[PDB]
Amino acid sequence: HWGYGKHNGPEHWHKDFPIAKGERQSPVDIDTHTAKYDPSLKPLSVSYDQATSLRILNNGHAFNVEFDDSQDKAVLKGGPLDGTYRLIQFHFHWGSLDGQGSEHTVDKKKYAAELHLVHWNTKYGDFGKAVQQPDGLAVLGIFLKVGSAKPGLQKVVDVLDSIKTKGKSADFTNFDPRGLLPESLDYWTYPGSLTTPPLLECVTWIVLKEPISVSSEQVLKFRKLNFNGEGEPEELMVDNWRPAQPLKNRQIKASFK
Ligand SMILES: O=C(O)Cc1cccc([N+](=O)[O-])c1
Numbered sequence: 001h002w003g004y005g006k007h008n009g010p011e012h013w014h015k016d017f018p019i020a021k022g023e024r025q026s027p028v029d030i031d032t033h034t035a036k037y038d039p040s041l042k043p044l045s046v047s048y049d050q051a052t053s054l055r056i057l058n059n060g061h062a063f064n065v066e067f068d069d070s071q072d073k074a075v076l077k078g079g080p081l082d083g084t085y086r087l088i089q090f091h092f093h094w095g096s097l098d099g100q101g102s103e104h105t106v107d108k109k110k111y112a113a114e115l116h117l118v119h120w121n122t123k124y125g126d127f128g129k130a131v132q133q134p135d136g137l138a139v140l141g142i143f144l145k146v147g148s149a150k151p152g153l154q155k156v157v158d159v160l161d162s163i164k165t166k167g168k169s170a171d172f173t174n175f176d177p178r179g180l181l182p183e184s185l186d187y188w189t190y191p192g193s194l195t196t197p198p199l200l201e202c203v204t205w206i207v208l209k210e211p212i213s214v215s216s217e218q219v220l221k222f223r224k225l226n227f228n229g230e231g232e233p234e235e236l237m238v239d240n241w242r243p244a245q246p247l248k249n250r251q252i253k254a255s256f257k
């Protein structure tokens with residue numbers, strides 16, 4: 001019984017999941033001066049035209065927007081990836097204050113939130129099998145700063161009141177995740193892990209350089225969600241980010257000079 005508190009937070013996770021102290025944990029600080037430009041890198045291909053959203057779920061640590069991943073409808077390819085990765089869900093991580101909330105940091109800078117588009121490698125057949133592989137997932141990470149509103153986020157923000165507590169879901173059809181992407185697909189990439197238990201080291205991370213802007217009112221709505229179930233004492237769903245972990249013997253590559 002893990003979470004983000006004083007008594008069950010990231011600093012405790014290693015007692016149940018010793019992989020917490022492993023060699024390829026996420027997130028990490030991206031030192032922009034030591035990331036190396038790689039001209040081997042292929043351009044990223046994001047193909048979201050046929051994406052079929054289904055449902056939005058408060059899972060007690062975040063909310064997830066789930067997709068139909070039973071065909072190649074929304075796929076990531078190229079960049080550092082070999083093969084085809086299917087979109088399964090997106091979620092966010094965010095803070096109690098605008099000055100924290102992202103998991104990755106850039107030259108020690110924390111953004112207000114971070115969006116994770118999670119994709120699994122089709123060569124493994126399903127998600128459950130893919131997470132057991134070192135190349136099973138590809139997560140596209142996008143930083144959020146507070147400024148102007150993001151119009152393409154607003155459909156997500158206005159359903160949040162219907163999923164306030166742990167275990168609530170709502171139908172969430174016809175959502176187009178293209179509206180959450182910044183103009184540029186310049187990125188950094190490195191091998192890492194899930195950032196929640198079970199902390200599996202199955203992720204190729206792809207972190208976009210250009211943040212999206214959201215409004216103060218949009219972020220505020222995220223902070224009204226609850227970690228608890230209905231009928232349990234209220235605890236606001238804030239600060240659901242794991243802090244930066246040691247880079248160890250990894251290199252972060254840049255797609256851009
Ligand atoms: O890294 C995250 O934010 C956590 C995350 C993401 C997607 C799947 C997960 N899972 O535990 O099966 C966990």
Ligand code: NI
Nearest residue numbers: 001002003016
């Ligand atoms: Ni538990």
Ligand code: NI
Nearest residue numbers: 091093116195
């Ligand atoms: Ni995440």
